[PDB]
Amino acid sequence: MENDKGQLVELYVPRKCSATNRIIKADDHASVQINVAKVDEEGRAIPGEYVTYALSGYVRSRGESDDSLNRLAQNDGLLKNVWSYSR
Amino acid sequence: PRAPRTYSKTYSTPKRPYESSRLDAELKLAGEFGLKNKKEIYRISFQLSKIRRAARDLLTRDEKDPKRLFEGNALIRRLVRVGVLSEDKKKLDYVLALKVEDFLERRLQTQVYKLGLAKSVHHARVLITQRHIAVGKQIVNIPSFMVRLDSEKHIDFAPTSPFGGARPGRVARRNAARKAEASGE
Amino acid sequence: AKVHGSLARAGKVKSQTPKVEKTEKPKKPKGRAYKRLLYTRRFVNVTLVNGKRRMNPGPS
Amino acid sequence: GKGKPRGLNSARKLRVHRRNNRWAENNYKKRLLGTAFKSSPFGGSSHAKGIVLEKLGIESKQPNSAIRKCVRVQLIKNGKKVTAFVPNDGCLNFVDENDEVLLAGFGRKGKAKGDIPGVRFKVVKVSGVSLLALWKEKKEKPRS
Amino acid sequence: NTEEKGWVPVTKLGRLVKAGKITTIEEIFLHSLPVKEFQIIDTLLPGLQDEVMNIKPVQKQTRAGQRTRFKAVVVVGDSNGHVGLGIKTAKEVAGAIRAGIIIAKLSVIPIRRGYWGTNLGQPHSLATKTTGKCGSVTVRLIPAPRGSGIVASPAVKKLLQLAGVEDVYTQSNGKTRTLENTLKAAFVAIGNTYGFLTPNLWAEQPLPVSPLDIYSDEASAQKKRF
RNA sequence: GACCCACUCGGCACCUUACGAGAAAUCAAAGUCUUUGGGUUCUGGGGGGAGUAUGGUCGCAAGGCUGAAACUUAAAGGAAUUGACGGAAGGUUGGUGGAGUGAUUUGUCUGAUAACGCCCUUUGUACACA
RNA sequence: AUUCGGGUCUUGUAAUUGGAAUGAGUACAAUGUAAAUACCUUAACGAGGAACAAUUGGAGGGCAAGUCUGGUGCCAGCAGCCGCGGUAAUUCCAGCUCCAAUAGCGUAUAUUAAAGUUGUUGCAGUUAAAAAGCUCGUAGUUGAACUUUGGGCCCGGUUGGCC
After folding, report:
1. By CB neighbour count within 10 A (0-12 exposed, 13-18 middle, 19+ buried), where does E141 fall?
2. For B121, which of B34, D61, D106, D141 could close a Cys bridge (C-beta 3.0–4.6 Å)?
3. Strand G contact at CB of residue D88, distance < 7 A
């Protein structure tokens, strides 16, 4: 997204989707950003730090965003079992 | 019958004749540089058009190609010797950009004004079309020309006609002889 | 349609209207001078109120 | 696959279909049938020169209520009975019964101009002078 | 005199704009935060100028006689790379126009402008072949080389000049005489530039943290008695 | 033999979405088409003139099949929308927000709630000086 | 830049005015040429206004420019299309002013583009024109997959930077 001599042009680098990698865009209001806080031993939330997930508008419209979110959070490592890869 | 002397028109008319944006903007150029018709502007934009399409045709092929190199270097060098494109952007991608203003600047009508001495551009045009001024030894009588860079410093008044030297003229002959000297019988 | 018609009025209006003459004036300077003149009246100062301008203003 | 055959070796059906289906548009029909030369008053030419027959008073269509003042003209070349409008204000009193006049078509290419039924031609010259020159008081009509 | 300015920052963006926490519109574009108030994008970037486009009357038969209204298509923009198209209908002309401008300011969208083929200083054309539809009118925008100009219909051309798209080819289909549809199609097309993966955009960034969460305690919907 | 439960192939269609498509009404296909190529037969190019004339060919006949032009006109239609009308059925207006590409509609409603602060409704319409 | 010294550049409007430069054109001579005419040259002449004057179409919208002035009163006419004209015409007839192109513009008929209104690229066929009553079937068009990849060994030219 650059010119010839370094200098990065192309204003605003879009957000990729977490689920399908489709570009969520400026006008699109159906898209969502989920923020999950970082737990540890000694309990409690610990504000400041977030594991983020950008769900697209289409994914939410179609109505299988839930499944995608179950998948995404699992590989990060905050769900023992829950969602089977197999079916 | 012999072979024909070939010919082709230099002006190229626009598509939409009545348009508010084009008519207002193009007439300013005509007023500044002192162009008598829109035909001249269209001619300049036709030459420019040809250059543009040529450049595009050069660019569709790959770099380090025999066709693209040679033609590019000669096109660019032609645009340099006339002085439209300066030395900084000698890249072939820049000749696509360009503008009509530069071309009109490079015309000999206004290069007399850009030097000076002729006061107004209109006055300069008059001087040119009335057989005054010269590129070197060779006299020029045409507003449109394209001065070829090296020729710039040699532009001055011609040996024939006043300012450069020689005789005064007609009106001065009549004032000096028929009026001033003729008072004494 | 019908071929018959009142042809007596052929050139009714061209005749009865008052045949006055052209007024003589100062000479319009032609060619490049005309272009100069156009450029001057347009791109100097005088225009109508609002963003839009009337190049031929009616006296009012 | 969108109706038509996109076969590589099926050019025949493509070109043939197109040739069959060209017969629809005006210009293709007018050219290939030879309709300008066979039919129509003029012989596919711009200006056809003619004599006259009589002056007319054409009853114009609604809403444009007037009388148009045309001329019935017999031509030289074929000698077909034609109707032809006379331009400008006045100017029917210039032409008379029997007079060499050079006609032109209106603009619309066949059929009516605007509100005049049947008439598909105007004029250009009468006695080889031009109506436009006569209306504007420039030139003089010869007596014969 | 007895006057006062009165901005009145309703919603969560107003306070941010007034306080001056967010400087640019880039953040807004990233996180798709819906601009409700028109005054957000005004003072956020004062360089955002304007434009009109077209006015046509729209009528309405009724019992008594006949109602009439004026529709104004108001396209607004700025020569860097942001544009808005605002259609509005009202009984007064000025009222239609002002409201249209407001609507255009509300819904602004940026344009991913790139190069024809070679890479050089400053983008000029569109990045990709984009197309937008509205009714019969499908408008297509094809990238053009340097100094080629905006080869299009006068309305679409104006829309593109507002954006600061210097050089671009166009086509269209359907009954293009209606600007109601055509300019909407153009808007859809220039909008879909950012919704298209080039290879340079596959380099996956980390997902920026939403700025709403950064300054939630500082500047947001406060209680406040008087 | 029948029925119930779960699965299964082949259709008959159906109900809900709109992912998409469509100018719309609408469509699980009229989708997978300007980001315009799965294969392939048939038909159309403004409306009248005319499914007429002329020609052939088919048939006992009626007609079918194939099927023009000159001339004429600035429309013709399609969908939906507001009224208006019916010798059809029953008993006021913007602000902001949605529903729509708009016309506009919703609000300003069945007797609660996509809304928040002679008259009417639904349908039919080739009328729209009604 | 001694802020109270006089005029270069001037944005336009002014028959107020003073010179200056020319051509178009007339022509000694020469050149040019088979021989001339032109051209190119150039003695002697030849600008300050009816001078040595540029027009051709438009001025409702499309399309740029007029709700200016008088005549005409659905008449004459304009009008490629929509439509103007029934006595206040921003469309007719004139005149004022303005706009376009400008020694060149307008008008016809043919044709190319726009016409993705012929469509292979690239149309449409539920209701707008259009899917043939349905099936068979010869030509024509099209028609599953599958029949040696990989691994190395060197030889070795082309790109760009420390060398």
Report:
1. buried
2. B34
3. yes
The DSSP symbol for C43 reads S
DSSP 8-state secondary structure symbol assigned to residue B174: I
| Cα B94 to the center of its chain, rounded Å | 21
Residues of B in contact with E145 (CB under 8 A): 56, 59, 96
A/D Cβ contact: 3+ pairs below 8 Å: no
| CB contacts, 8 Å: C13 with chain D | 89-90
Q: Taking the domains of chain D in order of start, what are their residue ranges?
A: 1-144
Could you tell me the fold of the domain covering E1-110? Double Stranded RNA Binding Domain (3.30.160)
Nearest to A16 by CA among E207, D14, E217: E207
DSSP 8-class letter at A55: E
Tokens (6 digits) for E219: 């500047």
H or E element at residue D35 = helix D35-38
Taking the CA atoms of D5, D8, D10 and D13 in sequence, report the sign of the dihedral they define.
positive
Parallel, antiparallel, or unpaired: how do β-strands E125-126 and E113-114 relate?
antiparallel
C36 to chain B: closest CA residue: B31
The answer to whether the Cα torsion of E196, E200, E205, E210 is positive or negative is negative
Domains of chain A: 1-87 (3.30.1230.20)
At CA D137, angle to CA D131 and CA D143, rounded to 5? Answer: 65
H or E segment to which residue E89 belongs: strand E82-90
Rounded CA-CA distance B38/B43 in Å is: 9
The fold adopted by the segment(s) E111-204 is Ribosomal Protein S5; domain 2 (3.30.230)
CB pair distance less than 8 Å for B122 and C43: no
Count Cβ atoms within 10 A of the Cβ of residue B180 and give its class: 0-12 exposed, 13-18 middle, 19 or more buried. Answer: exposed
The two beta strands, A15-16 and E113-114, are unpaired
Dihedral of alpha carbons E153, E157, E160, E165, sign: positive
**Å resolution of this model?**
3.9
The 3-state DSSP class for residue B125 equals helix
Structure determination technique employed: cryo-EM
Tell me the domain boundaries of chain E.
Answer: 1-110, 111-204
